[PDB]
Design a protein around this nucleic acid. Structure first.
Lengths: 168, 168, 168
RNA sequence: AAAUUGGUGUAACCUUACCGUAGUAGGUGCUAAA
RNA sequence: AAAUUGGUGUAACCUUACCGUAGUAGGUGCUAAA
RNA sequence: AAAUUGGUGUAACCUUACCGUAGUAGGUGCUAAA
């Protein structure tokens, strides 16, 4: 019921972006892009929603969740349009206490993000279900479904790729 | 479920005040007195509750609803004691956007009044039912019913007048 | 459902402290220590929870309720650890209006305490039940039950004393 | 990283929220009358 | 337009709310003790 | 009057709240990034 952050291996990310160019760059050079775990599986897949720090972009509310700290500063945006299915061997859980020891500023940011998300996980969940449903409909897309398909990863294609990974 | 404002024809108002002198003067010279529509019919009649701008009078809470704007200024009082039954041909719906085009200050006041009322319509409804019941009881009036009868229009008499109008 | 304050006769208090030294000193010299009545009887006994003005002590939350006024000043602490069973002849109801006439400052303090408590009586009740249960368990006490037994009056012993009083 | 349609309020603007069983919250403006 | 009783809080005052299965919210005052 | 353990938050500090089906509220600090 309470969100867990994760980093995803750049190997698996690059492997996914082969099938869909909208998968987020991992930029693992200093802080590998954290993802939030969707609370329940979707069609047997563990899904993960990427965070971005590009807080001032034009986001449509249907595919994003803006995070705010107690003083109302923008502290990240969850991109539900770029959520991805990931196998449990290609993701690592983030220990905020650990991250705070290695990098005090960043770990504390992550704590703020955690405190915001545990109050707002209903909304993430809600949006995740609405867009997944609409992106995966067939066949003739409404006006909205066309927009969603354009701005979102090809979820079904990525699920196949996840399946293909399960040759291990 | 959301309130609609109306103006009432001065012909019908004058016709009602023949039967009961407590019917409100319409003062149609610049802004004909707006009324709020009671959400549900009463004994088959559409009832309408008059607004007044006399915000500082001594009102008893049982027969009034004070409206306030976001900065807490007084912006009207609904006189449930002066509510009246009106046939649908003798009342016109108020288009706030239209009124705002013709008279920016007044139309905007009316918007504020609308925004307040849509949050407070339960209370209007509640008070409308309590006073209508008490005014129309028989036979021997309690202390309260005597007060209410004195300060309120003779609802049953006005309903008869409404019926008589239905010769059309 | 709404709390009543009481004073308890110093005779009965001294009689109780014979059996358990943790019973609160009554200090009846100017303002006899007020107690709040537990809303429901416990095993047939009327219980009363003492107030203290020692607002800055180290209290454990499990056995106390801190009272605050509207400006957030500390205005007493209910000691659920020192609650006692009292027969109805050894306690007097406090008339706050009366106390306010005799001693304006103190009576008004008591009003503030009343206004706080009527909003917080669920918590008093809640804590009263938890500690009474744990203090009166047997036989082998948990870590917590040992702490509670040490800091609380011997409720069962005081109940016997209450029974013994009923020779009247 | 990039890409974020169109809609929902008797709602003028910004931020926030909502998504078709769709308008929440904070500002700004207006400061009006029967 | 005019006319708005009396009541509800262990509640002193103002505004607000409530209406007999009746006291909410914001101020002011008090700033007390076991 | 005295006496107030130990615990509960992906929670650094103070106050407040909670009590094992256990972390609410207000401050302080941090002001970080993909």
């Amino acid at each position: 019921d309470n969100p867990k952050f994760h980093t995803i291996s750049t190997e698996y990310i690059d492997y996914l972006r082969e099938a869909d160019s909208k998968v987020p760059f991992n930029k693992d050079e200093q802080h590998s892009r954290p993802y939030v775990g969707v609370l329940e599986k979707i069609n047997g897949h563990d899904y993960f929603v990427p965070l971005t720090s590009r807080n001032d972009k034009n986001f449509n509310s249907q595919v994003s969740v803006k995070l705010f700290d107690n003083d109302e500063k923008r502290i990240g945006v969850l991109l539900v349009n770029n959520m991805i299915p990931v196998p449990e061997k290609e993701c690592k859980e983030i220990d905020i206490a650990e991250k705070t020891a290695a990098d005090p500023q960043y770990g504390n940011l992550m704590l703020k993000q955690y405190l915001f998300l545990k109050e707002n996980m209903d909304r993430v969940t809600n949006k995740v279900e609405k867009v997944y449903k609409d992106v995966t409909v067939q066949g003739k897309p409404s006006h909205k479904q066309k927009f969603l398909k354009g701005v979102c990863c090809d979820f079904p294609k990525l699920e196949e790729k996840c399946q293909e990974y399960k040759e291990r």
